[PDB]
Amino acid sequence: GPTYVQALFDFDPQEDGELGFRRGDFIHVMDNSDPNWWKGACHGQTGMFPRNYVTAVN
């Protein structure tokens, strides 16, 4: 099943391809091969986000 994380902090994209989100958002983790920047999806957008802004759900 898909892995989900939940946002601990609001994140405003600064570069192309980054995924924005607000606290409480559930993000589907699509790629966690890098220890710092993961690829995720939320509400129909996908993009890279900082792992230190989220916490594990499942």
């Binding site: 902090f9 890098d34 920047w37 900082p50 802004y53």
Partner: peptide
Amino acid sequence: APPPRPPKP
């Protein structure tokens, strides 16, 4: 303040 953006690889 929110945490610093980590290094891009």
